[PDB]
Design a protein around this ligand. Structure first.
Ligand SMILES: Cn1cc(-c2cccc(C(F)(F)F)c2)c2sc(/C(N)=N/C3CCS(=O)(=O)CC3)cc2c1=O
Length: 101
């Protein structure tokens, strides 16, 4: 396991602690979010991020950050602002980026 894999696994653990319901733990299904796949072109979730770390697909912290932001932007695109999902996404986006400096 490489230094980047170790750091990104660390960051991912810390970020998932901010989502205790696991709303971001797995790909959003169309069953839970009607029409999701037709609206969101590039889905992302923490579980996919973990698989990408294990597969050694991230070669920089920038790339990991970009996936994290994608995940949050998707939730802010799909959901109305008055929803737990939009608010959580916005919160964890800023906290996450700070956390990761
Ligand atoms: C990231 N994310 C996650 C969920 C989600 C995933 C698993 C389980 C659950 C739960 F058990 F809590 F229901 C929710 C959902 S569900 C959803 C959904 N149905 N959202 C609607 C909220 C009301 S609205 O008028 O904004 C239309 C979208 C969006 C997302 C999401 O982005």
């Amino acid at each position: 396991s490489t230094p980047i894999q170790q750091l990104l696994e660390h960051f991912l653990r810390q970020l998932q602690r901010k989502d205790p319901h696991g709303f971001f733990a797995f790909p959003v299904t169309d069953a839970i979010a009607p029409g999701y796949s037709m609206i969101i072109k590039h889905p992302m979730d923490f579980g996919t991020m973990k698989d990408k770390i294990v597969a050694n697909e991230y070669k920089s912290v920038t790339e990991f950050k970009a996936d994290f932001k994608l995940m949050c932007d998707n939730a802010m695109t799909y959901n109305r602002p008055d929803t737990v999902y939009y608010k959580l996404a916005k919160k964890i986006l800023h906290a996450g980026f700070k956390m990761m400096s």
